[PDB]
Amino acid sequence: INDNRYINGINQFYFSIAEGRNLTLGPLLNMPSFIPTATTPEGCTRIPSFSLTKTHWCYTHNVILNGCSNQFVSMGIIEPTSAGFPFFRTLKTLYLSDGVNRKSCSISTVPGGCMMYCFVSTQPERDDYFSAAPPEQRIIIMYYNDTIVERIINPPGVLDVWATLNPGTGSGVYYLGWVLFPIYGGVIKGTSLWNNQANKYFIPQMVAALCSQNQATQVQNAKSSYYSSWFGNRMIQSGILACPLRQDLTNECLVLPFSNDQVLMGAEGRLYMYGDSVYYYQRSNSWWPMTMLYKVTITFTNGQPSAISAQNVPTQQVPRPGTGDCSATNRCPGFCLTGVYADAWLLTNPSSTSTFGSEATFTGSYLNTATQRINPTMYIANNTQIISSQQFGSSGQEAAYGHTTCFRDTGSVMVYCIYIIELSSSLLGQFQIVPFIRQVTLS
Amino acid sequence: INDNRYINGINQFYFSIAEGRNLTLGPLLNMPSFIPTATTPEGCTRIPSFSLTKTHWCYTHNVILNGCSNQFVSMGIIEPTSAGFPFFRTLKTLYLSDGVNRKSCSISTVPGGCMMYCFVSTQPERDDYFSAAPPEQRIIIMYYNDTIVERIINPPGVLDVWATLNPGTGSGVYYLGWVLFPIYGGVIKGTSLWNNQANKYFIPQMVAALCSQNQATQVQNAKSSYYSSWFGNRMIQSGILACPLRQDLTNECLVLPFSNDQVLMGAEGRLYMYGDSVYYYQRSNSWWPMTMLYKVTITFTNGQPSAISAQNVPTQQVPRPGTGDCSATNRCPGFCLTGVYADAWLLTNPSSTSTFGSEATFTGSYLNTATQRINPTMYIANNTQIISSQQFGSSGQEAAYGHTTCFRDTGSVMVYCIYIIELSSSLLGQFQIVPFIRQVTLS
Amino acid sequence: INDNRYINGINQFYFSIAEGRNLTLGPLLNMPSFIPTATTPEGCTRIPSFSLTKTHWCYTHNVILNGCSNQFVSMGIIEPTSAGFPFFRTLKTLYLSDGVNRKSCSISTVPGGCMMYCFVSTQPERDDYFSAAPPEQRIIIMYYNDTIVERIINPPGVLDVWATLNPGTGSGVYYLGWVLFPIYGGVIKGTSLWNNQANKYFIPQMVAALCSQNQATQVQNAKSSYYSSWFGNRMIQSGILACPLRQDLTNECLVLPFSNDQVLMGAEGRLYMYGDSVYYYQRSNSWWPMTMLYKVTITFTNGQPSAISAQNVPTQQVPRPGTGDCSATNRCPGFCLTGVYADAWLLTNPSSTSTFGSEATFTGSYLNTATQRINPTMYIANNTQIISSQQFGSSGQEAAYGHTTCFRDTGSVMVYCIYIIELSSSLLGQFQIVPFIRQVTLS
Amino acid sequence: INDNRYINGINQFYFSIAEGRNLTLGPLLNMPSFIPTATTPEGCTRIPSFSLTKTHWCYTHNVILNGCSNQFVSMGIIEPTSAGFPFFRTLKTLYLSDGVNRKSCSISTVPGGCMMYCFVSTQPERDDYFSAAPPEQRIIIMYYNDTIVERIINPPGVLDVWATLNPGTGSGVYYLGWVLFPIYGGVIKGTSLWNNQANKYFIPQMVAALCSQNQATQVQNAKSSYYSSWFGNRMIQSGILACPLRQDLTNECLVLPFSNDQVLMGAEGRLYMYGDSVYYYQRSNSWWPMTMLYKVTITFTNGQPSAISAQNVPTQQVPRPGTGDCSATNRCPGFCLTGVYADAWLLTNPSSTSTFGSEATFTGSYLNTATQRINPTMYIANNTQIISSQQFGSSGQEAAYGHTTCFRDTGSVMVYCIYIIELSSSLLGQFQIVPFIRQVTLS
Ligand SMILES: *[C@@H]1O[C@H](CO)[C@@H](O[C@@H]2O[C@H](CO)[C@@H](O)[C@H](O)[C@H]2NC(C)=O)[C@H](O)[C@H]1NC(C)=O
Ligand SMILES: *[C@@H]1O[C@H](CO)[C@@H](O[C@@H]2O[C@H](CO)[C@@H](O)[C@H](O)[C@H]2NC(C)=O)[C@H](O)[C@H]1NC(C)=O
Ligand SMILES: *[C@@H]1O[C@H](CO)[C@@H](O[C@@H]2O[C@H](CO)[C@@H](O)[C@H](O)[C@H]2NC(C)=O)[C@H](O)[C@H]1NC(C)=O
Ligand SMILES: *[C@@H]1O[C@H](CO)[C@@H](O[C@@H]2O[C@H](CO)[C@@H](O)[C@H](O)[C@H]2NC(C)=O)[C@H](O)[C@H]1NC(C)=O
Ligand SMILES: *[C@@H]1O[C@H](CO)[C@@H](O[C@@H]2O[C@H](CO)[C@@H](O)[C@H](O)[C@H]2NC(C)=O)[C@H](O)[C@H]1NC(C)=O
Ligand SMILES: *[C@@H]1O[C@H](CO)[C@@H](O[C@@H]2O[C@H](CO)[C@@H](O)[C@H](O)[C@H]2NC(C)=O)[C@H](O)[C@H]1NC(C)=O
Ligand SMILES: *[C@@H]1O[C@H](CO)[C@@H](O[C@@H]2O[C@H](CO)[C@@H](O)[C@H](O)[C@H]2NC(C)=O)[C@H](O)[C@H]1NC(C)=O
Ligand SMILES: *[C@H]1O[C@H](CO)[C@@H](O)[C@H](O)[C@H]1NC(C)=O
Ligand SMILES: *[C@H]1O[C@H](CO)[C@@H](O)[C@H](O)[C@H]1NC(C)=O
Ligand SMILES: *[C@H]1O[C@H](CO)[C@@H](O)[C@H](O)[C@H]1NC(C)=O
Ligand SMILES: *[C@H]1O[C@H](CO)[C@@H](O)[C@H](O)[C@H]1NC(C)=O
Ligand SMILES: [Ca+2]
Ligand SMILES: [Ca+2]
Ligand SMILES: [Ca+2]
Ligand SMILES: [Ca+2]
């Protein structure tokens, strides 16, 4: 279990609206990395997932022997060092290496262990969208007492509805007895979902002022952005997978898709917990290149999640490198299928302002360039501007995904955020996933 | 505990004299590294120590926050991956961060845990040699059941005899109920040790053929090489520290110095176990730049180690970068105080030939250059030549210490050696200690 | 169920056209044989059939007590050994010994067990062709829960149409709810089948360049090759038997003959599964002595197989020992009735080239001689040449049928092929059916 | 469970003294072999162990990949074929392949499964005798419900008493709640066992009439035959290992050595069950080259085996190939260390004659030659002559160990004996262990 200095500073909004205005990033602090490195120049470690909770943390990433498989799992606690800052102490390690190609895995903390959700890849991504059958889905529970239970799940409404289903790779969350995971995939034309989603679209609140197209043109393009001709003519859908914490899971997990009137085209994502509220981060793999965060309201019918609703925190801040007419400078609706995973952590409560998210502050990392996965930069920002930032390495430095997480030392009363970034390395391995850590200072 | 595939392939001579002649190194294999990385550009991780035994392994290294402290400890088991090669699974982690400057630590496996030996540094190395008082010594026992017992030891014959005492940083060994650690330091003039060591010297068997000085000149210079005017005019001594496995250690550990007629000037080192025989690796910090390995015979008087004797395995292979008239090309006796730690693992038994070590084969890493810590290269070699080698990275690549360890997969019947090398990194940290792993093929 | 290392490497094309060009056979590996041996010098074990699927494998062969009956059935899973290679673990054995002379049996894997198809022999083969009545047909289902259900089937269009009907002995396949088995026999003159097949013939694409007869002469001879005067003046027909997976089968199995415009004279054969496509191997018992493989397209009318279409993979590689003017050196059409069963496994997808099968790669075993069943040799070959081969035993070594099957270890990422060959033995039994296994290396 | 035709014909004396006189061997019958074959020319399958009981049978043998490791285990039942003779139906298979070198394994049937006893070899046999420490011992229980429990046992009175301990490789037996295994090894000079065994010797009853030395010379030589200077100067001891049927065995198994006044020098062996009496077969690895069988009387003190007593069945029949002055023609006491394992099954009760074993009849296989492991021959014999025999293969045919077992078909009322012989093969593998089966006819 985590040290008393952290058990009460996890999964919360740490600053008040007023304080958020005076927040800045401190120097990067040096701690022993809990994320394993490759031991060959061509080894590839990618797609990390990190979950932290009151009692402990869970970590995992994919390992491919030659170029960019096995799945490395880690788990432990946080404890203070004599310098005052954290040390992620690993208490158990696991390496799922057995021939099953588990990919796009999302991990979540659960009482006594970690629950991981992966899908079994057996062909190029695109082929998964064309094949009417969905890839195999698996949820592995790994207890700290070293028991391991892996199950091949078959949730209702997936077969013959989703041509593919993938976990979002971002952390899932343990909520009211269930483990929720972000998911996405392609839905088949003619299905109820497809029909119920028909004619729906979502346009971020700050698009109008920045887009040059008219309201009617924008609406038409936005509607079309949820369908991909390149990916088997499927409706790219974002959603949540809810599994009850059991060791005999089969078809009890439920697929809850987001309404396309509240969310953009399906993509990778992450689920958060700020107090009793669930939040969702949706990668911007469509036309809008800015950070997308939503407050998720979950409805339970008879002790079972029956529907989800998402409210976007309106921003125009922190763009992501895209390709073509969907670079970080795009502002107009249309169909796009490019981007990067770059989640953000809300240091301030969006519900604290009279108008939801009118003044929000978040932190994370992003690749500062319009079309290249280059110039990784850690930052703090509000809805319209970046109020603090520090690029890592010299310009041209290649990077990829970035998972950010913050917690507070209730002893010293300071917030530390960990920025897990995939860095292109020149010495060992294709990428080196680094758990950068620094403080978020008030002043 | 280690997997059944390794429990019977540890601490042994794996090949016969005949087989050693046809051994070559395989490609480097990619496994998740169990050695933690720095998270800042200037963070320094150095001085590793690794001990592997039938049941498990222990690992540790020093961490300094800005440039080249805290001590990271790790422990776990070995298990096969679906590719056939090993995966060092960490089962527990520890970070000794509390203000005590533990340095030059050596670690050893012990039943149920790890025993580490460090000294507390409070001033520049040189000052330790001038001060008549020796630094404080500590042995920490860390059990897998998470109990930790640290003791400040005071072995007899240290106070007022040794101006300084340091662990060799190389792994110690658990032998017949005792934990043995390599040690070295400076002895004060006028002491019994100094007197008993008076006029003693050691000249490697293959020096004559390579040295141009005459037998009388060589003898005179060799005698003088054990005294350093730069390090407080002390006799630089190599030796072994033997501690009985107890949780209340005070003054039961015994300091057993090597006779200077059998060993070169004191330096860092490592202890090994090949079956029932103990072996010692002595860093070449003096005039002779080649790998020094000795078969150690331990004498017990009344259940207590009373004396050690060392027999050198004669070689002229694998030089180490030195400074001035003590580069890798030096062959003549004199006083030197330069070099690097580069241990070697004996893949063949030296006692198997009629004349001890007439045909020996060893493997390890070495810096291929005469005076610079550059061009790290993993190799296999006999007494006079390198029969297999592969440099890592492009020329100019900086590196430092290298700790090598081999074991066998009794399932697939192949030997794997792990080459832990301190690599100068350009991205994260001053150095990146990497646990390179590859196979030693017969053919 | 099979180990996770194989569940996803079964019934697929393992290499790309480009990779197929650099494939070679590895050394034979030693595993415990799952095929039972005779215990007397004259005992005869012959005619094996092997089916492997995602979950498990099925095996069977005929046993005759004195010289060349009972039917041995076996079933199990595949699991890795500490050497990395497979071990076919038998989980159940059966010996059908009850007075019913079940011959020419083909076996196929089915969910939860094996389905075997045999015919009851009561007289010399030739007599079966002269008698207007067809031998009795039986399909036995053997569940892993040890239930056994044998049925005497009577499919429509057999009585008074086929003077005889035999399973091809090669494995059948479980496809979309039905079990398909290769069949062959003789059709009576004057029947619809005979009439619809009238004037049809098939000439392999690579015959012209190798045959010296002119297009008109070849066509005439090919037409006549489907009729045997020696076997009761019947049209020797090849085909597929499709049975729905039921325990009360009577007349629901359907006989689907191949068009004689797409296939050569009827003979033994085997059915395969490469992804969602069905393939057929037709023994060369007629004039063309080279390996015959066809991609089978199955048409369903009202949930029932209604017609099959076959597309040949054009080759001139891997000949088979024949008699007279039909040796391995024959290239001209005519009537022949000699050959051996020697199937081949496609390591490459024939549909991957713009022109179907323009560059195909297959592996298997063949008897390297023109007219004798001698010199068994395992090989890898493309359409025109053998790119890798290794003969077994010394020249003159007698052998017979060869059934080849390949799968992949998704853990180590290597393909293993099993070459089941009937070997003439000198010690125990007439033949020793051996399951040779080796790897197919890329490089 | 076995068929009703055999459940009541196992582990008994099948013939009366009078009937034994008219017994002859029938022709070898052909059944599917339940003993797996090697799949490479150099693969080595050796050292089989077979246990048959009322309910089922257990089988196992050692597998070495190149030349003469893993351990193959098999288990099943016996059922009649339509020819009337048996068919050993395998119901489960296991392959212990994990890097642990389990050798000299003995197997025994136990309720619900098989219990196997092996020792872990890590060095040449001879070295085990010189090292004061005994090899590691293991007993593996394998249940038909597929549970497997392996334990590293440490019975009292082994450490520092036996320099080595090996199972006899012959089948053990389940007796009154305990599993008994034959064992042998070398005892250290100066131990209680050594002292209690001092001056003891055993001379077979029929030696005098055949030996030319006098009673005093014979006694002196016999005493010395229990000590081997070649095997570390140890007393070669034969004995029984008794383990209570538990899944948590540690030190409950008991080592019960035979008195050297009743048994010859230690060697491999087998334990039998004839009704309620236990019998022991001791390989003739010493001076006397004839078959050694003893009726074992076991004493229990407080529900625990406390002592064993052996009564020899006096014979001079069925010699075994030995080396030097210990060939099959030797009859004089002295020290020898050569021979072969060739057990025998008692078809007649030795206690049925007024004088124990005055007229005994046994069957088995033996190598008919004086010093070579050649000419395997199955036979039936009384104390002084071979009344029936049939050699296998042509002269010169190499073979090795032979394990014989008989049971009765209470339905047809005939006895079948299975002769498991290691045959040197020319086609596949070094040896082919064959389960020959034939009937023992009365008339
Ligand atoms: C490790 O912890 C888990 C979690 O408590 C244990 O899981 C229990 O497993 C049994 C069946 O094996 C279930 O009936 C219990 O309900 C589970 N507990 C719950 C509610 O989580 C697991 O057994 C533990 N490992 C052991 C046996 O030491
Ligand atoms: C995000 O932060 C920026 C920078 O702090 C805010 O911009 C400032 O707005 C105040 C008005 O409240 C002006 O006095 C400053 O001059 C602005 N800074 C400059 C020079 O850019 C911005 O308003 C914030 N966005 C919100 C309201 O959340
Ligand atoms: C963790 O393991 C160690 C090693 O067994 C335990 O150490 C024992 O400690 C007590 C005093 O606390 C000694 O008297 C024993 O002799 C020690 N055992 C020996 C011989 O090593 C330690 O107690 C264990 N931790 C716990 C209490 O769970
Ligand atoms: C160390 O290895 C080298 C290289 O294998 C040995 O040198 C070879 O010695 C043999 C004689 O035994 C010669 O036939 C070769 O020509 C030598 N190799 C070459 C060309 O350098 C060397 O002898 C070995 N050192 C020993 C004896 O341990
Ligand atoms: C062994 O498995 C088979 C396959 O499931 C069982 O077969 C069932 O048999 C009943 C009639 O006996 C049918 O009505 C079911 O439809 C069959 N199941 C199907 C659909 O395959 C068989 O009963 C099992 N053996 C037992 C009874 O344990
Ligand atoms: C089958 O394999 C053979 C051997 O690899 C191919 O023949 C080679 O063809 C290339 C041209 O692509 C030539 O450069 C080589 O010289 C040929 N090898 C020799 C010397 O025989 C053959 O073309 C392959 N058949 C196909 C096209 O599938
Ligand atoms: C073992 O069997 C042999 C052969 O049957 C016995 O020898 C026979 O003994 C009888 C006397 O009872 C003579 O009439 C025969 O002539 C002997 N057979 C020959 C010609 O060798 C022998 O006695 C048996 N051994 C015993 C007594 O167990
Ligand atoms: C942050 O700093 C500003 C400027 O120094 C100060 O006016 C403001 O009150 C601070 N915010 C709070 C309330 O912490
Ligand atoms: C090693 O290889 C050489 C050359 O192929 C061979 O002659 C030698 O016997 C091998 N060494 C051994 C005995 O393994
Ligand atoms: C196979 O080997 C050849 C020759 O080394 C190489 O050129 C070719 O690229 C390889 N094929 C592939 C793409 O795997
Ligand atoms: C065995 O055969 C002999 C000779 O035919 C006969 O005299 C004897 O009674 C038989 N033994 C018995 C009693 O079965
Ligand atoms: Ca799909
Ligand atoms: Ca000092
Ligand atoms: Ca007929
Ligand atoms: Ca020993």
| Closest ligand to Cα A115 | 1
Q: Across the beta sheet with A386-391, what order do the strands follow? A: A344-346, A362-367, A376-381, A386-391
* Interface mutation vs chain B, best among C4, C6, C82, C443, most B CBs within 10 Å: C82
D82 contact residues in C (CB cutoff 8 A): 70, 97-99
**Breaks in chain C at C–N > 2.5 Å: after which residues?**
68
Tokens of D261: 């006044």
- Nearest one of B433, B405, B402 to B279, comparing CA atoms: B405
CA-CA distance, A330 to A321, in Å (whole number)?
A: 10
| Cα A416 to chain centroid, rounded | 19
* Distance from Cα B130 to the centre of ligand 13, integer Å: 6
A70–chain C nearest CA distance, Å: 9
Residue of the nearest CA to atom 14 in ligand 9? B19
Residue window 205-264, chain D: list those with CB within 8 Å of chain B.
none
Tokens of B428: 């994260």
Of B30, B39, B97, the CB nearest to A437: B39
Start-to-end CA span in chain C (Å) = 32
Three-state DSSP state, A236? strand
Q: Work out the number of other CB atoms within 10 angstroms of the CB of residue A102.
A: 23
Residue of the nearest CA to atom 12 in ligand 9? B19
List C-alpha distances in Å: A154 to A266, B7, C187, C284.
21, 41, 48, 46
Q: What SS3 string covers A71-82?
A: EEEEEEEEEECC
- Nearest one of D440, D431, D442, D435 to D64, comparing CA atoms: D431
CA-CA distance, B139 to A4, in Å (whole number)?
A: 29
Chain B residue closest in CA terms to A144: B91
CA-CA distance, A364 to A379, in Å (whole number)?
A: 6
Inter-chain residue contact C39 with D30, CB threshold 8 Å: yes
Start-to-end CA span in chain A (Å) = 32
Which residues are CB-contacts of C239 (< 8 A; sequence separation ≥ 6)?
C182, C183, C184, C255, C256, C257, C258, C266, C308
Cβ(D156)–Cβ(D130) under 8 Å? no
* Distance from Cα D16 to the centre of ligand 11, integer Å: 12
* Distance from Cα C112 to the centre of ligand 5, integer Å: 10
- Nearest one of B248, B252, B231, B320 to B284, comparing CA atoms: B320
Cβ(A278)–Cβ(A298) under 8 Å? yes
**Breaks in chain B at C–N > 2.5 Å: after which residues?**
68
Residue A86: exposure state from Cβ atoms within 10 A (0-12, 13-18, ≥19): buried
B358 interfacial to chain D (CB closer than 8 Å): no
Residue window 118-147, chain A: list those with CB within 8 Å of chain C.
120, 122
- Nearest one of B133, B256, B134 to B193, comparing CA atoms: B256
Which residues are CB-contacts of C269 (< 8 A; sequence separation ≥ 6)?
C168, C170, C182, C184, C238, C280, C281, C282, C283
| Closest ligand to Cα C132 | 14
Alpha helices in A264-364 (DSSP H): none
B5 contact residues in C (CB cutoff 8 A): 82
CA-CA distance, D253 to D167, in Å (whole number)?
A: 13
| Closest ligand to Cα B245 | 3
Q: What are the residues facing B436 on neighbouring strands?
A: B419
Region for residue A424 given its phi and psi (left: phi exceeds 0; alpha: psi -120 to 50; beta: otherwise)? beta
Cβ(A25)–Cβ(A437) under 8 Å? no
Which run of H or E residues covers position A130? helix A125-130
A120 contact residues in C (CB cutoff 8 A): 8
Letter string b/e over residues C284-296, b meaning 16 or more CB atoms within 10 A of that residue's CB: bbbbbbbbbbbbb
Is the distance from the beta carbon of residue C309 to the nearest atom of ligand 6 less than 6 Å?
Answer: no
* Distance from Cα B143 to the centre of ligand 3, integer Å: 9
C67–chain D nearest CA distance, Å: 11
- Nearest one of B95, B88, B92, B86 to B61, comparing CA atoms: B95
Q: Work out the number of other CB atoms within 10 angstroms of the CB of residue D144.
A: 16
CA-CA distance, D334 to C396, in Å (whole number)?
A: 51
* Distance from Cα D153 to the centre of ligand 4, integer Å: 48
Inter-chain residue contact B434 with A37, CB threshold 8 Å: yes
Is the distance from the beta carbon of residue B252 to the nearest atom of ligand 9 less than 6 Å?
Answer: no
CA-CA distance, C308 to C305, in Å (whole number)?
A: 8
CA-CA distance, B91 to B3, in Å (whole number)?
A: 14
Chain B residue closest in CA terms to D101: B410
CA-CA distance, A28 to A381, in Å (whole number)?
A: 18
CA-CA distance, C239 to C259, in Å (whole number)?
A: 9
Chain A residue closest in CA terms to B424: A427
Experimental method: X-ray
Cβ(A66)–Cβ(A45) under 8 Å? no
Could you tell me how many CB contacts below 8 A there are between chain A and chain B? 126
Is the distance from the beta carbon of residue B16 to the nearest atom of ligand 9 less than 6 Å?
Answer: no
CA-CA distance, D407 to D8, in Å (whole number)?
A: 9
The domains of chain D are located at: 1-443
CA-CA distance, C30 to B139, in Å (whole number)?
A: 51
* Distance from Cα B129 to the centre of ligand 13, integer Å: 5
CA-CA distance, C152 to C121, in Å (whole number)?
A: 14
CA-CA distance, C71 to C52, in Å (whole number)?
A: 19
Residue recorded with tokens 């060739």: D342
If one residue of A92, A114, A148, A247 were mutated to test the ligand 1 pocket, choosing by the most ligand atoms within 8 A of its CB, it would be A247
Cβ(A263)–Cβ(A166) under 8 Å? no
CA-CA distance, B169 to B171, in Å (whole number)?
A: 6
A97 interfacial to chain C (CB closer than 8 Å): yes
Q: What are the residues facing C308 on neighbouring strands?
A: C298
Radius of gyration of chain A from its Cα atoms, rounded to whole angstroms: 20
Start-to-end CA span in chain B (Å) = 32
Report the DSSP pairing between strands C173-175 and D344-346. Answer: unpaired
CA-CA distance, D61 to D401, in Å (whole number)?
A: 12
CA-CA distance, D12 to D349, in Å (whole number)?
A: 9
- Nearest one of B408, B286, B266, B277 to B335, comparing CA atoms: B286
Q: Work out the number of other CB atoms within 10 angstroms of the CB of residue B189.
A: 13
Residue C352 DSSP one-character state:
G
Inter-chain residue contact C45 with D37, CB threshold 8 Å: no
CA-CA distance, A423 to D143, in Å (whole number)?
A: 51
- Nearest one of B333, B59, B55 to B208, comparing CA atoms: B333
Residue A246: exposure state from Cβ atoms within 10 A (0-12, 13-18, ≥19): middle
Q: What SS3 string covers chain B?
A: CCCCCCCCCECCCCECHHHHCCEEEEEEECCCCCCCCCCCCCCEEEEEEEEECCCCEEEEEEEECCCCCEEEEEEEEEEECCCCCEEEEEEEEEEECCCCCEEEEEEEEECCEEEEEEEECCCCHHHHHHCCCCCEEEEEEEECCCCEEEEEECCCCCCCCEEEEEECECCCEEECCEEEEEEEEEECCCCHHHHHHCCCCCCCCCCCCCCCCCHHHHHHHHHHCCEECCCCCEEEEEEEEEEECCCCCCCCCEEEECCCCCCCCCCCEEEEEECCEEEEEECCCCCCCECEEEEEEEEECCCCEEEEEEEECCCCCCECCCCHHHCCCCCCCCCCCCCCCECEEECECHHHCCCCCCCCCEEEEEECCCCCCECEEEEEECCCCEEEEEECCCCCCEEEEEEEEEEEECCCCEEEEEEEEEEECCCCCCEEEEEEEEEEEEC
Q: Across the beta sheet with B136-143, what order do the strands follow? A: B102-110, B113-120, B136-143, B148-153
CA-CA distance, D171 to D293, in Å (whole number)?
A: 14
Tokens of A95: 């390496």
Tokens of A151: 């199950």
C83 interfacial to chain B (CB closer than 8 Å): yes
Three-state DSSP state, A36? coil
Inter-chain residue contact C4 with A100, CB threshold 8 Å: yes
Chains D and A touch (3+ CB pairs under 8 A): no
List C-alpha distances in Å: D416 to A179, D26, D139, D391.
63, 9, 31, 18
Is the distance from the beta carbon of residue C315 to the nearest atom of ligand 6 less than 6 Å?
Answer: no
Tell me how long chain A is.
443
Is the distance from the beta carbon of residue B111 to the nearest atom of ligand 3 less than 6 Å?
Answer: no
* Distance from Cα A442 to the centre of ligand 8, integer Å: 9
B305–chain A nearest CA distance, Å: 37
- Which amino acid, A372? Q
Q: Across the beta sheet with C376-381, what order do the strands follow? A: C344-346, C362-367, C376-381, C386-391
List C-alpha distances in Å: D174 to C314, D155, D255.
63, 18, 16
If one residue of C15, C21, C442 were mutated to test the ligand 10 pocket, choosing by the most ligand atoms within 8 A of its CB, it would be C21
List residues near ligand 11 (CB under 6 A): D 18-19, 22
Is the distance from the beta carbon of residue C359 to the nearest atom of ligand 10 less than 6 Å?
Answer: no
C8 contact residues in A (CB cutoff 8 A): 99-101, 120, 122
If one residue of D22, D352, D382 were mutated to test the ligand 7 pocket, choosing by the most ligand atoms within 8 A of its CB, it would be D382
CA-CA distance, B376 to B400, in Å (whole number)?
A: 8
Q: What are the residues facing A103 on neighbouring strands?
A: A119
User: What's the CATH number for B1-443?
Assistant: 2.120.10.10
Cβ(B282)–Cβ(B342) under 8 Å? no
Inter-chain residue contact C410 with A97, CB threshold 8 Å: no
CA-CA distance, C336 to C228, in Å (whole number)?
A: 9
| Closest ligand to Cα A357 | 2
Which run of H or E residues covers position D217? helix D215-224
A91–chain B nearest CA distance, Å: 5
B8 contact residues in D (CB cutoff 8 A): 99-101, 120, 122
List chains adjacent to chain A, taking adjacency as at least 3 C-beta pairs closer than 8 Å.
B, C
- Nearest one of A290, A236, A293, A289 to A266, comparing CA atoms: A236
CA-CA distance, D264 to D282, in Å (whole number)?
A: 8
List chains adjacent to chain B, taking adjacency as at least 3 C-beta pairs closer than 8 Å.
A, C, D
- Phi, psi values for residue B7, rounded to 5°: -50, -25
Residue recorded with tokens 């030795």: D350
Tell me how long chain D is.
443
Is the distance from the beta carbon of residue D383 to the nearest atom of ligand 7 less than 6 Å?
Answer: yes
Residue window 397-416, chain D: list those with CB within 8 Å of chain C.
none
What resolution in angstroms does the PDB record give? 2.6
